[PDB]
Design a protein around this ligand. Structure first.
Ligand code: FBB
Ligand code: CL
Ligand code: CL
Length: 163
């Protein structure tokens, strides 16, 4: 793992990450989708061979030797707040298992269920806290990707708060 495991946040295209593997905010059917999922499809299209997986799970497919971890957050349009929250926590726990199995020293990760799966709500804090619960016990350097200038500030603050 990383010598001093850390969290960082960058405001850029996750398709341009400088990490040893990437987490896709995937749909359950392995379709190209939109947002992060569309950029991942354009950069690593080979990774979508048999990528379909249920909500609350993660499935890794290699693009050459570069791992793409397809993590399926819930669509809060379809789920109750209670069941959506349980599936969102589960998806990040499956990501932590896959990152550990792969033996990577770093991972690029988006906030799951915060874009077109958010059901039109701000889920920054909900999704980030589930990311921390899952990844805190791993020793990989985690680099969180966002697009919004205000989200970059709010994620940076939440990382710095814990030290
Ligand atoms: N290509 C893209 N990368 C990201 C990374 C984070 C994000 F929130 C949106 C996008 S769209
Ligand atoms: Cl960029
Ligand atoms: Cl999303």
């Amino acid at each position: 793992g990383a010598m001093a495991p850390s969290y960082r946040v960058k405001r850029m295209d996750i398709a341009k990450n400088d990490e040893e593997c990437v987490v896709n905010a995937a749909n359950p059917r392995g379709l190209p989708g939109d947002g992060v999922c569309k950029a991942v499809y354009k950069k690593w299209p080979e990774s979508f061979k048999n990528s379909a997986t249920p909500v609350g799970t993660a499935k890794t497919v290699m693009c050459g030797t570069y791992p793409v971890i397809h993590a399926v957050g819930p669509n809060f349009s379809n789920y109750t707040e209670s069941e959506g929250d349980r599936e969102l926590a589960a998806a990040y726990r499956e990501v932590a298992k896959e990152v550990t199995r792969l033996g990577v020293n770093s991972v690029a990760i988006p906030l799951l269920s915060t874009g077109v799966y958010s059901g039109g709500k701000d889920r920054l804090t909900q999704s980030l806290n589930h990311l921390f619960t899952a990844m805190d016990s791993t020793d990989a350097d985690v680099v969180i990707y966002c697009r919004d200038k205000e989200w970059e500030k709010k994620i940076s603050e939440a990382i710095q708060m814990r030290t």
